[PDB]
Write a protein that binds this DNA or RNA. Structure first.
Ligand SMILES: [Ca+2]
Ligand SMILES: [Mn+2]
Ligand SMILES: [Mn+2]
Length: 430
DNA sequence: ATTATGACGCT
DNA sequence: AGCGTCATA
């Protein structure tokens, strides 16, 4: 009852750019705007692999991971933008720099956690308190929430999408307890007002549109964000969770999309997140471990305490390339040339990082895959990263992997290598 | 031949 | 440390 924590102490948002690499290319090339279009890497093999898809193209059934030749079968007028190639590999610099544009704007509002190239979490708890005292107990107008959905509304006793959105928003605002500075629903609402402002700032200053979720923790904020994309934001209140979770497939919740989520489903014989409430914490811990069990017990009730980490910059800088099928590297000269290509891009990014961010990487991680191995990585070895020099890094990388060569012939490499990966880690301030 | 990443957990 | 899981464009 009175001592039952309800996980309503924070206001957390997740902001995620719509079709992000597509928007980056559409900003650059106005001919691609408002068209079915996609971003592709490489070209020779089946027109290249698709990694981002505009909402116009999604309407034709175009998806990520599709070959462009195959996407063209669904959407013959599909427009394509190719990822840059440098040193024989895809180079994602344009998108990393565009990401920085967005992250720097968000950081003006609050501490952010960079969660991917195109999204960040925001802890808005403090900003909400300040906006609340500024408002002087004044009601919140629907005009301050022009792109917000309230999940679960309208309900109770119009056939247009925007009309439904407004109906739900009106019901929500009509009910609001604006006299209480500590009502969690009011706090989320003010959070949503700030996120409208954040999203308006991002679009004004970059041209990029985004969606957002506003809730009491990161998992619900992430889930909320996807409920009404593109170019909209969704408030998921504590109260909305039972109905929301009652038909929510378990795999939709962050961290349950894989083997663990599959095991929750199989072992417990359930399908939806809400069904987890019928197990004791000990029962869940017995099947899924102490940490996962406690997390599941609280999460199915809408409660999670994972903090928004103060981290705007990536913790690692990596360069990787696959060498599929017949392109697998079979000679020492081959392996060494590509290590050099990778190491040269890595040096470029590392040197830029050192100047921009006042830090230095101190460890080099080298990873490879061998033909025949199903695993993403076959072997991972580390060595010291003492100098930002590509020739040294590539020589060092070779030294730590060269004994993987099962060939009796030195010149040859067996089994052939189907992936190389160089990753700079363990940064220290400089 | 689904590619290039990046964070974090386990032992 | 090296490996595995889960995640996003
Ligand atoms: Ca996105
Ligand atoms: Mn994203
Ligand atoms: Mn996506």
């Amino acid at each position: 009852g009175p001592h039952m924590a309800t996980g309503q102490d924070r206001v957390v948002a997740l902001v995620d750019m719509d079709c992000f690499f597509v928007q980056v290319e559409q900003r650059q090339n106005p001919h691609l705007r408002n068209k079915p279009c996609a971003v592709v890497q490489y070209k020779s093999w089946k027109g290249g692999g698709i990694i981002a898809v505009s909402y116009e193209a999604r309407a034709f059934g175009v998806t990520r991971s599709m070959w462009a030749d195959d996407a063209k079968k669904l959407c013959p007028d599909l427009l394509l933008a190719q990822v840059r190639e440098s040193r024989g590999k895809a180079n994602l610099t344009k998108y990393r720099e565009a990401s920085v544009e967005v992250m720097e704007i968000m950081s003006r509002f609050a501490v952010i956690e960079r969660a991917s190239i195109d999204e960040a979490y925001v802890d808005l708890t403090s900003a909400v308190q300040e906006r609340l005292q500024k408002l002087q107990g004044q009601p919140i107008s629907a005009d301050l929430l022009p792109s917000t959905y309230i999940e679960g509304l309208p309900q109770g006793p119009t056939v247009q999408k925007e009309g439904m959105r407004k109906q739900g928003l009106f019901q929500w605002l009509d009910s609001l307890q604006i006299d209480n500075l500590t009502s969690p629903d009011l706090q989320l609402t003010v959070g949503a007002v700030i996120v409208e402002e954040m999203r308006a700032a991002i679009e004004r200053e970059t041209g990029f549109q985004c969606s957002a979720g506003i809730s009491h923790n990161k998992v619900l904020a992430k889930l909320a964000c996807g409920l009404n994309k593109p170019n909209r934001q969704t408030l998921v209140s504590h109260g909305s969770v039972p109905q929301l979770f009652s038909q929510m497939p378990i795999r939709k919740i962050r961290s349950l999309g894989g083997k663990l989520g599959a095991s929750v489903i199989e072992i417990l014989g359930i399908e939806y997140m809400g069904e987890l409430t019928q197990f004791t914490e000990s029962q869940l811990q017995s099947h899924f471990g102490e940490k996962n069990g406690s997390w599941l017990y609280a999460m199915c009730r809408g409660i999670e305490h994972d903090p928004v980490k103060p981290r705007q910059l990536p913790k690692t800088i990596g360069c990787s390339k696959n060498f599929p099928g017949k392109t697998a590297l079979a000679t020492r000269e081959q392996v060494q040339w590509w290590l050099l290509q990778l190491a040269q891009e890595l040096e470029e990014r590392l040197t830029k990082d050192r100047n921009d961010n006042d830090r230095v990487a101190t460890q080099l991680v080298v990873s490879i895959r061998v033909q025949g191995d199903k695993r993403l990585s076959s072997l991972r070895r580390c060595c010291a990263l003492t100098r930002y020099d590509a020739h040294k890094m590539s020589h060092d990388a070779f030294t730590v992997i060269k004994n993987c060569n099962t060939s009796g012939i030195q010149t040859e490499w067996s089994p052939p290598l189907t992936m190389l990966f160089l990753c700079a880690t363990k940064f220290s301030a400089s």
